[PDB]
Structure 1
Amino acid sequence: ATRTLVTASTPGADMTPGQLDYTSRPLDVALQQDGWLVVQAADGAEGYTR
């Protein structure tokens, strides 16, 4: 056994929060670390976002 191949992969994503821009608007919100806002997805399902 000598031949071993390479396969690229994307193991999930990065959950480290970014930097918060302070905008003087009441509707722009930022969640806690490892927290998600819930939206109704495109196909009538549920999705989570930041």
Structure 2
Amino acid sequence: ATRTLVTASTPGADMTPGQLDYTSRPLDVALQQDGWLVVQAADGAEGYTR
């Protein structure tokens, strides 16, 4: 068994929080290290975002 094909693959993601800037807008929010805002997706099932 010599031939060994290679296929690309992507793990889930990287959860390092990004840099945040202060725009002083009254209702702009930034989460904690592992925070997630819940929204209602188009299909109806809830989803998480930042």
User: TM-score normalised to the size of structure 2?
Assistant: 0.94
Partner SS, residue 47 of structure 1: strand
Cα RMSD (Å): 0.6
Taking the aligned partners of 1:6 and 1:26, their CA distance within structure 2 comes to 50
Q: How many residues align?
A: 50
For residues 14-44 of structure 1, what are the alpha-carbon distances to aligned partners after superposition, in whole Å with 9 as ceiling and x for unaligned?
1000001101111110000111000001111
Q: Which runs of 5+ in 1 are unaligned?
A: none
In the TM superposition, structure 1's runs of 4+ consecutive aligned residues that sit over 2 Å from their partners are: none
**Residues in 2 aligned to 1:2 and 1:24: alpha-carbon distance in whole angstroms:** 61
